[PDB]
Amino acid sequence: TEEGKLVIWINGDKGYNGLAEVGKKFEKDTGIKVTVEHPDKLEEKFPQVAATGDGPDIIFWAHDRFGGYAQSGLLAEITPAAAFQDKLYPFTWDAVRYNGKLIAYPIAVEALSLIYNKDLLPNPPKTWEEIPALDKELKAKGKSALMFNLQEPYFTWPLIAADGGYAFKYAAGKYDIKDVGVDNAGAKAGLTFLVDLIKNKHMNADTDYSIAEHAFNHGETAMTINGPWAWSNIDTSAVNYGVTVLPTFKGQPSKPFVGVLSAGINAASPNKELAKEFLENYLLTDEGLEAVNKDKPLGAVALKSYEEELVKDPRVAATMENAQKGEIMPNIPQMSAFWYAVRTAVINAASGRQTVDAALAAAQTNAAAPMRNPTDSLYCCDRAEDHACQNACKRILMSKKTEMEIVDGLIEGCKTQPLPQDPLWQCFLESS
Numbered sequence: 001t002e003e004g005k006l007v008i009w010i011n012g013d014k015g016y017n018g019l020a021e022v023g024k025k026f027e028k029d030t031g032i033k034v035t036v037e038h039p040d041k042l043e044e045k046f047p048q049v050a051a052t053g054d055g056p057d058i059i060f061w062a063h064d065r066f067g068g069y070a071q072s073g074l075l076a077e078i079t080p081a082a083a084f085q086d087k088l089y090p091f092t093w094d095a096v097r098y099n100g101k102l103i104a105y106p107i108a109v110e111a112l113s114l115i116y117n118k119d120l121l122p123n124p125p126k127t128w129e130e131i132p133a134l135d136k137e138l139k140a141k142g143k144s145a146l147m148f149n150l151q152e153p154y155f156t157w158p159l160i161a162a163d164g165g166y167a168f169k170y171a172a173g174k175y176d177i178k179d180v181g182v183d184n185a186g187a188k189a190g191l192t193f194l195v196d197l198i199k200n201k202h203m204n205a206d207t208d209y210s211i212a213e214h215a216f217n218h219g220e221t222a223m224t225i226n227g228p229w230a231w232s233n234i235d236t237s238a239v240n241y242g243v244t245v246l247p248t249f250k251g252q253p254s255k256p257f258v259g260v261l262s263a264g265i266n267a268a269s270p271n272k273e274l275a276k277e278f279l280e281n282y283l284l285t286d287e288g289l290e291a292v293n294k295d296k297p298l299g300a301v302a303l304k305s306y307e308e309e310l311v312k313d314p315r316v317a318a319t320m321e322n323a324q325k326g327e328i329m330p331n332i333p334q335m336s337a338f339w340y341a342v343r344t345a346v347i348n349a350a351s352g353r354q355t356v357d358a359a360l361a362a363a364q365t366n367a368a369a370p371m372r373n374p375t376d377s378l379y380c381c382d383r384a385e386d387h388a389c390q391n392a393c394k395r396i397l398m399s400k401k402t403e404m405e406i407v408d409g410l411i412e413g414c415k416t417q418p419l420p421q422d423p424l425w426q427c428f429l430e431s432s
């Protein structure tokens with residue numbers, strides 16, 4: 001990062017060229033150059049490189065990853081005034097609150113929908129259970145009923161959750177990280193339905209994002225499951241399509257995990273005030289979100305003035321219908337382990353490497369695995385009386401060290417007076 005310029009990371013399936021146009025308008029008005037990048041695996045790279053000080057000023061991702069980033073000390077607290085907060089829907093702010101603090105700007109609400117080819121399939125199925133017979137009919141015409149990305153558990157989750165699968169039990173404003181619901185009867189029933197689709201040759205286990213997108217956009221399969229970002233490529237294609245409610249399973253709505261695309265400010269950025277200018281006054285405007293949306297649709301945007309108009313598009317209305325049948329993702333740090341566990345389980349079950357029951361039993365254990373965290377005490381570093389110690393403290397707590405190594409490193413870098421009288425050490429003693 002350099003002072004006086006902004007670097008932004010956003011995923012490659014989003015409207016990064018539109019976002020670059022917002023960056024050009026920012027540069028035109030203010031002189032600040034904005035560089036938009038879309039690295040591979042950016043949600044994993046960010047915590048890796050925010051440790052070498054080689055991260056972006058601003059990172060975009062769904063809000064579920066941001067609690068972990070914030071817990072690890074990678075994100076700055078944002079400071080929107082009340083008048084700006086009133087411009088966005090309250091529930092979008094809720095998704096970017098962590099430990100009582102706002103840690104990112106909400107951009108847009110994402111939910112998966114059922115996307116279908118009206119020429120192949122004028123009436124889409126209401127139920128998952130009728131898809132096998134639909135596929136049989138379409139196969140006689142040289143087509144298939146449904147293709148979607150089986151390599152990312154985001155896309156299979158709506159089916160896993162339909163009959164009662166869940167990530168973490170939510171009990172009175174709190175998620176219980178030891179109560180994981182990926183191995184209950186409903187999760188098993190949904191994943192078994194998927195595996196049976198594959199066993200019966202109505203889908204194949206290797207289908208990924210590119211294969212499913214190609215197939216739908218070239219008229220080869222009647223349906224796909226995807227989010228708003230995908231509509232742009234379908235529009236460019238020759239396909240007459242609709243976007244509608246996901247099929248039910250066992251008479252229950254499919255329950256997608258709802259993401260809020262969010263923009264966080266790197267805690268290590270020397271440009272936090274510039275990033276705030278850009279996000280509040282350029283991106284989160286009608287004209288800024290339109291520039292991104294026109295490139296790849298955002299979904300249901302967090303900005304009320306724009307969303308009130310945008311929701312008139314039936315595809316956005318359907319996005320919110322599916323969102324209301326699902327659940328907003330937790331943002332707790334355990335979400336990374338949850339997603340990795342379910343990803344392995346879906347892939348292993350779909351490929352036949354494991355049974356559904358064996359895969360999900362391992363997933364429950366892996367998702368609930370406790371993890372040793374020093375960064376619980378990062379707030380104590382801000383009670384340091386000098387900046388050198390403050391920063392030494394932060395590096396030590398973010399360092400994967402043992403408790404002994406943390407204490408010892410703090411003595412080396414942050415002893416300026418007797419420990420019992422130092423607010424940093426008083427905090428660490430009470431906390432760690």
Ligand SMILES: OC[C@H]1O[C@H](O[C@H]2[C@H](O)[C@@H](O)[C@@H](O)O[C@@H]2CO)[C@H](O)[C@@H](O)[C@@H]1O
Pocket residue numbers: 011013043062063064065110152153154155227259339
């Ligand atoms: O598959 C696990 C994955 O799901 C979500 O990622 C979504 C993302 O929210 C969408 O905006 C779009 O990019 O598709 C992704 C799935 O490939 C979670 O947000 C993510 O943390 C999680 O790893």
Ligand SMILES: [Zn+2]
Pocket residue numbers: 214
């Ligand atoms: Zn292609």
Ligand SMILES: [Zn+2]
Pocket residue numbers: 214215218220
């Ligand atoms: Zn093809």
